[PDB]
Amino acid sequence: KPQLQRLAADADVDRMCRLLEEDGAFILKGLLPFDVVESFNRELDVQMAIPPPKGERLLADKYPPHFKYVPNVATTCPTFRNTVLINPVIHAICEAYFQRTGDYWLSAAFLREIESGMPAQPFHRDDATHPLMHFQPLEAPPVSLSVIFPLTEFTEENGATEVILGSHRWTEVGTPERDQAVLATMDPGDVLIVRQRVVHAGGGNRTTAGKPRRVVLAYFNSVQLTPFETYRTMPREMVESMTVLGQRMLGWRTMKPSDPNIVGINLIDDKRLENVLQLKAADSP
Amino acid sequence: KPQLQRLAADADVDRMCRLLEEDGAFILKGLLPFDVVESFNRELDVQMAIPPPKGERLLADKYPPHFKYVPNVATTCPTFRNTVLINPVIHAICEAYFQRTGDYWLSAAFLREIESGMPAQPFHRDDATHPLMHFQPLEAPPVSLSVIFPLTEFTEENGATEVILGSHRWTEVGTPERDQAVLATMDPGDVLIVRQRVVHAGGGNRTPRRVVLAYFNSVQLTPFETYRTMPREMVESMTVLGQRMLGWRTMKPSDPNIVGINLIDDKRLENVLQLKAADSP
Ligand SMILES: [Fe+2]
Ligand SMILES: [Fe+2]
Numbered sequence: 325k326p327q328l329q330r331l332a333a334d335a336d337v338d339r340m341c342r343l344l345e346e347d348g349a350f351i352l353k354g355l356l357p358f359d360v361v362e363s364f365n366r367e368l369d370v371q372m373a374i375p376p377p378k379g380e381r382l383l384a385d386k387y388p389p390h391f392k393y394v395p396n397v398a399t400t401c402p403t404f405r406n407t408v409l410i411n412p413v414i415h416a417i418c419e420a421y422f423q424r425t426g427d428y429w430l431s432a433a434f435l436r437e438i439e440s441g442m443p444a445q446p447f448h449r450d451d452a453t454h455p456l457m458h459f460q461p462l463e464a465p466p467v468s469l470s471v472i473f474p475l476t477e478f479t480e481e482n483g484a485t486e487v488i489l490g491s492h493r494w495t496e497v498g499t500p501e502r503d504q505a506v507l508a509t510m511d512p513g514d515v516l517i518v519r520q521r522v523v524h525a526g527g528g529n530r531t532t533a534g535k536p537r538r539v540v541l542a543y544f545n546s547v548q549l550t551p552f553e554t555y556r557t558m559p560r561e562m563v564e565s566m567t568v569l570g571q572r573m574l575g576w577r578t579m580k581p582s583d584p585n586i587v588g589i590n591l592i593d594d595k596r597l598e599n600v601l602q603l604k605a606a607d608s609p
Numbered sequence: 610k611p612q613l614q615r616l617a618a619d620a621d622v623d624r625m626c627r628l629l630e631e632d633g634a635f636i637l638k639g640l641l642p643f644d645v646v647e648s649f650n651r652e653l654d655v656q657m658a659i660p661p662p663k664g665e666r667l668l669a670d671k672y673p674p675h676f677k678y679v680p681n682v683a684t685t686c687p688t689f690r691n692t693v694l695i696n697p698v699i700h701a702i703c704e705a706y707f708q709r710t711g712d713y714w715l716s717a718a719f720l721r722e723i724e725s726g727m728p729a730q731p732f733h734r735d736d737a738t739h740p741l742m743h744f745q746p747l748e749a750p751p752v753s754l755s756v757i758f759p760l761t762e763f764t765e766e767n768g769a770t771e772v773i774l775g776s777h778r779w780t781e782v783g784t785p786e787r788d789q790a791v792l793a794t795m796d797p798g799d800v801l802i803v804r805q806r807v808v809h810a811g812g813g814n815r816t817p818r819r820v821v822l823a824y825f826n827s828v829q830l831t832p833f834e835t836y837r838t839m840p841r842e843m844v845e846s847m848t849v850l851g852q853r854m855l856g857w858r859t860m861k862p863s864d865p866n867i868v869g870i871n872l873i874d875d876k877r878l879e880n881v882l883q884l885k886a887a888d889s890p
Contacts, residue, residue, distance in 0.1 A: 381876075382859070382869055382875050382876065384875055395874060396873055396874065425740070425741070426740075452865040452866055453862075454829045455711075455750075455829070455864075455865060456710075456745065456749065456752055459745055459746055459748070460744055461744055461746070464741065465741070546741065547831060548741050548830060548831055549829060549831060550829055550830060550831050550832075551870075551871070552870055552871075553873055554872065554873050554878060556878075557878075581738075581740055583740075584737040585738055585740055587668045587671060588667055589831055590832070590833075591834065591835065592835050592837075593680055594668055594680040595665065595666070595667065596667070600838055601838065
């Protein structure tokens with residue numbers, strides 16, 4: 325039974341892109357160093373500790389009271405914003421993956437903790453946030469990529485992600501059996517990369533009175549697709565402390581879908597947003 | 610040869626929907642009163658009279674200079690911002706048209722002025738700005754509507770929009786003959802509504818001709834023009850509907866998106882901003 329391929333972080337990017345086309349997913353081993361993972365985890369500890377907001381919680385109010393979720397970690401976790409978000413290997417993968425569609429940016433990056441006693445999810449595709457994706461044919465340029473960061477170990481017992489290899493080629497999800505999937509068992513520092521249309525399920529957490537399984541999910545989408553999370557209320561000084569790449573990911577610059585769009589997107593006064601704003605960056609004059 | 614159907618501005622919206630389904634386009638007669646057209650034209654004149662810019666012009670630099678252009682007219686034309694953008698008939702059409710797709714907003718609205726002596730555009734579908742639309746099948750919920758506001762007369766001579774009726778059902782555009790199209794001859798204040806996938810062409814101007822093109826898209830699609838640099842006092846002078854159109858509020862794609870889009874801190878954008886509107890504090 326074929327398993328998810330595990331590649332070294334410094335492996336060939338064309339190999340990675342071909343695995344996405346064939347299997348639909350793969351794992352990078354030891355992409356993030358321990359100190360970066362540990363730093364990010366402390367920042368996420370802090371956000372987990374903040375008690376539930378008083379009024380409306382748009383996503384959280386739609387799920388049961390046990391739902392553990394922290395949105396838009398880019399705005400509250402410097403290690404994500406300044407280091408993880410701009411990881412060169414992730415962007416090498418994105419550049420290759422999105423060659424046909426053009427520029428991409430961050431639609432969302434958020435935290436989940438899955439506590440002991442949670443059942444596995446049903447098999448599904450991530451095509452709900454932008455429902456138009458449901459009607460995109462297989463042969464169309466991909467518009468979404470999932471980048472999944474385990475922040476605790478992912479094990480068979482605690483709900484390692486279940487992925488059905490090659491299932492992006494299926495017409496529909498159908499009703500597959502659990503033994504058709506393989507597990508994304510991983511350690512902190514690893515990353516799981518999942519192609520659009522791949523059938524998968526969150527593994528829940530079958531441990532008894534154990535610690536929660538922690539994960540950060542980042543969705544990189546074609547700039548044609550509206551970000552779920554809008555980073556437009558971030559302080560200007562915080563945004564100007566990021567690199568150009570980081571700013572581009574968070575929607576603060578004009579971007580370019582592929583031809584036949586020959587102009588761009590996210591612009592105003594027929595000029596680039598960053599020029600209208602006179603936006604500085606950490607790595608630009 | 611069947612022509613574009615002309616409806617009264619107070620016609621039933623279900624009749625308008627049937628025409629978009631069958632023909633792919635129709636014309637509303639006298640939607641905007643003379644005084645609205647006049648004030649909008651006066652505002653556009655002011656922008657056209659201001660000296661040209663010292664730097665790159667992203668869209669304008671892609672066309673020959675007989676193509677005249679005022680971008681994102683909502684930022685400079687109060688009549689568009691306060692009256693045209695929130696027209697109840699246009700929004701009745703949009704609400705019906707996008708019932709399978711969810712919320713919609715303004716991707717772009719800009720002036721095109723075509724000087725005399727220009728030939729017509731090639732036939733095309735409006736699927737270039739968001740190329741993913743090219744791969745969306747006919748059966749999918751529509752994600753874009755083209756709304757065309759003539760600000761001068763559209764005649765057979767001066768480049769009335771050329772529209773091929775029923776062409777949304779075509780698998781591909783190819784290279785059509787001009788005689789397949791019919792003309793959207795119109796007076797200022799009329800509006801031409803064109804469904805996604807309908808093959809059409811700008812008529813150029815073979816005598817300037819003035820038109821404002823507005824593209825209302827599913828909120829799933831990133832606006833071409835971003836209105837995020839609008840002064841807060843300008844934003845708060847608009848109605849809630851206007852603010853929603855210009856990207857200043859959280860919006861709702863169709864279920865299975867049960868949450869929304871364009872939000873932060875799991876809250877509505879307008880709540881995080883504490884945004885007032887003309888018709889809601
Ligand atoms: Fe999922
Ligand atoms: Fe067009």
